């Protein structure tokens, strides 16, 4: 299957070019994707726009979330909701080292791109 060989070489060259660009946001989302943390909609660029992401396990949750803040694509995002693999609401208090085996992974985080400028305008 020559078309499949070419596809594989084209995909490998793509990620070689991406790494050569050495952009922090691109590196972040590629490195997250490698761990199973992938987006579900197109990553938006305007403030307060909605992002949904898959979080596959507790280790990746702790590597990306602190409090109600999700760090991704060189930006901060305010977590609005977390639901589990059966689409049931999960409170952040439930996501602990001890309790995570009780959860239906992966979790789906919905968050809004954070804004630091004149928040009460």
């Amino acid at each position: 299957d020559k078309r499949a060989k070419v596809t594989s070489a084209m995909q490998t060259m793509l990620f070689t070019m991406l790494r050569k660009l050495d952009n922090d946001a691109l590196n972040n989302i590629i490195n997250n994707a490698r761990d199973g943390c992938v987006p579900l909609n197109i990553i938006p660029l305007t403030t307060a726009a909605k992002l949904m992401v898959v979080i596959p396990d507790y280790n990746t949750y702790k590597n990306t979330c602190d409090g109600t803040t999700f760090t991704y694509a060189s930006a901060l995002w305010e977590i609005q909701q977390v639901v589990d693999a059966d689409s049931k609401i999960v409170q952040l208090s439930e996501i602990s080292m001890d309790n995570s085996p009780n959860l239906a992974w992966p979790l789906i985080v919905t968050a809004l791109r954070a804004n630091s400028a004149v928040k009460l305008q």
Partner: protein, 74 residues
């Protein structure tokens, strides 16, 4: 230096669109139109900041397609 990356990121966006096309994204009419517009925006970008931010969106389309590409290239 920066003009080097400008052409590099524009070249990369054409490959990204071609990889997405080969993954049959053209069958998703609305999604494919959004991919083409982002690719167009990158080619027409004025500075590396705008091009990189649009590439973030464009690349997130590929990254959402689990199993379509491997983690071995990630």
């Amino acid at each position: 230096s920066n003009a080097s990356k400008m052409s590099d990121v524009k070249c990369t966006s054409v490959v990204l669109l071609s990889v997405l096309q080969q993954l049959r994204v053209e069958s998703s009419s609305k999604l494919w139109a959004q991919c083409v517009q982002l690719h167009n925006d990158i080619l027409l970008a004025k500075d590396t900041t705008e091009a990189f931010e649009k590439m973030v969106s464009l690349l997130s389309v590929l990254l959402s397609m689990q199993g379509a590409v491997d983690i071995n290239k990630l």
